[model samples]
Target: EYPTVNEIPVGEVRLYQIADGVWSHIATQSFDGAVYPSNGLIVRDGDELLLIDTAWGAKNTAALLAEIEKQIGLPVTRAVSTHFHDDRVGGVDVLRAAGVATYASPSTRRLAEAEGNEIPTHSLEGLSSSGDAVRFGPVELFYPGAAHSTDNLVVYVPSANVLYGGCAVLELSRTSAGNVADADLAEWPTSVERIQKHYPEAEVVIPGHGLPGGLDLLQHTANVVKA
Candidate 1:
């Protein structure tokens, strides 16, 4: 009854239950004929829904959104952009059309806009480059400096003890710092260390890409960047 996977038009989509109130969406996307996957998170608080990221494009995002709502019977009220990457906020326009309030760090918004991606509805300014906690519902969005991307932020779910590390973190199986084209490699390790220290209680940790793992995944990311 849990951890179901399905194939869609463009790629694949999978759902994993983090807890009774939390779920994770793993979406696969195609680029230059190569397939890659990204992760998004969902938290259900009463009748409200908070999505941490979106699928790769408008069609994918819309489909996923509709499926989630149909399964849970609640409309998504808000979403957060982990960064400005297409895999993270590509569905901004679709979400906006459906009246979902999307939030992103100022830098994330600026970069996304520059790249001609959909802009988040809310600016999470001042929250970037700081250790301050911004609470959306019961989830906490924390910026631990630049890692995979300058504007990347991690979402922490306290009740479920889950950490959606986004692209700023990596899966345990990764041996290299990925997509360094827009990354701060020198600071990546320490950036992950900060998150590890900040969310010591996180029992489940999901990266922006690949399968979710335990807290050790954070260390694995730090180790890779340091190597």
Candidate 2:
């Protein structure tokens, strides 16, 4: 079933159950008349909810927050952005207004400011530097270096063996490295390789757009970057 939360003037908001306490949200964005999907994740830590990447904008993000609270009966308290793109951090202002603590990698914050977008509330240390991973509650923030964007980050949930690959990893149907306007094309393959090596056990991998898949997405991303 295509479970949709609510429909906005531009597009719709939908939710998918990834695991017991993990869910992913897909927000719709439209340019002219063509509509597209943007993916984000929500994780439950006891009674609190942690969001990874907000929707395309404040309206969609607010809709998503209402729907999630309605479904889970809890308030969202924390959020993390995978990059500085609008689809990733557009709703940061809404989140901050709601008193939700928002975080982003140092590079993400910098790039967002450079691009004239609102910066995240908190800066994540060690993410902009060399590091295997950073622990945040039950999630792991994996920075595979510059690929899709200079500040792309993937969220890993070890308890459920799921990885929210963000925009750093492409969907199964993608045959090209998309939106390379800010991507490091030369380092793309190596970054994806690091993701595969680090999360080899990820059975379900969610991309920033389109459907989720398994380890094959990692290999597919690498191949496309090579092409």
Candidate 3:
């Protein structure tokens, strides 16, 4: 079947079992003109939840978190950050405040450190500190290299056969080509290939900005990189 991208729970969890254990929260553009791109996710073994990128800001993040709580009712073992940008990491503070373990790469951790307690880092200030939140269940953070940013990381849930490729690449909409302000153009395409290699069986691709797609999204993204 073609990859599905449904609106996130209107007032609840509009989940789809795309793969064995994989699910996508394709939340609709609800709530006060806020733009919510597809928030990628992974339902780990034993029904543990690992969310890859939070929404645009606090409002959206809270909504997303509430939605997760409403649906899964399980403690979010790990909150993964796709990168250090505000949009992806905005809700880190909120999650960290809730005692949810937030995971990022050494590069991103360093970036957060270098930036001196940005939102992602504020998690540590009375919130959770940024570290390898490997305390979560069986999910692993794959460093696809510093392409999207020096800190772009992907979260893979083995039980779900799902890969949440943060702002690493656009799934269906426009790709960045070589015009990305924070992108390591030289490393971007290679990173995509590496990610694809690592999660070859990923049936669903949740992008940071667009609808989720299948393997075709990777090729389309490569086309943009080569443009």
Candidate 4:
């Protein structure tokens, strides 16, 4: 087991070691006196790093890349955004400028463009529907229907048994649907259950916001949505 308590400040964000060769970088944005903190994932892919989601903004996203190289000593060779939200892909432009091969689901791409937000340069077009998956080295990308967003994506690291659920799965303690504007209320719980069934081996579950927790986070999210 690795130490997850240590939080090393990387410019405007804080980075933590979530598991062996797996990292988390959290950045905050000010809104209504609430520091809207969002989490992004990083995993070691051989000699390179695979970024999952960009930081909250352009500045933090840029710092994340440099800090990753300085702290982890690996260049970010590729990235995958969990959704089209600004919190997830806000720094995609920066990723592109850095020449990182960033990708998202085809649905995510359409949603991003519809909202006039930053979109990933490429898409995992091979994915078709719920349960469909593709591998990026040790990371497995899964689409389990719509939850937080219609195009939301999930990442699973088989080597580490870590599930990067992004916003598709909420932290265990959440009772409120943080953002419902784009949520599918009726199918949200169903989507959560799909993930629970798919990645039963996932010991570490990391949400888009708040802290990293166990696989129970998926059920808690389903309970809240079902309630």
- Candidates in order have lDDT scores of 0.84, 0.85, 0.61, 0.84
> How high a TM-score does candidate 1 get?
0.93
Which scores greater on TM-score, model 3 or model 4?
Answer: 4
- Candidate 2 stretches greater than 4 Å from native: 1-11, 31-33
Model 1: per-residue Cα lDDT at residue 130? 56
Candidate 2 C-alpha lDDT tens digits along 89-130: 988998999889999988889999999887898988877654
- The estimated TM-scores of all candidates read 0.93, 0.93, 0.75, 0.93
Task: Give Cα distance to truth, residue 214, candidate 1, Å.
Answer: 0.8
**Given candidate 3, what's the lDDT at residue 212?**
71
lDDT of 1 by residue, 191-220 (tens): 888998899999999988787889999988
Which lDDT value does model 1 have at 134?
84
**Superior by lDDT: candidate 1 or candidate 3:** 1
What value does the lDDT take at residue 65 in candidate 2? 83
Better of 3 and 4 by lDDT: 4
State how far residue 218 of model 2 sits from its true place (Å): 0.5
lDDT of model number 2: 0.85
- Predict model 3's lDDT versus the native: 0.61
- Give the per-residue lDDT of model 3 (tens digit) for 1-227: 32233444432334445466556554433333553444556464465676666664556566767766776676676766667776566667777777767766545666766664334532222112212223235666666775667677776666666667777767666745422777887777777888788779987776766667787777777678767
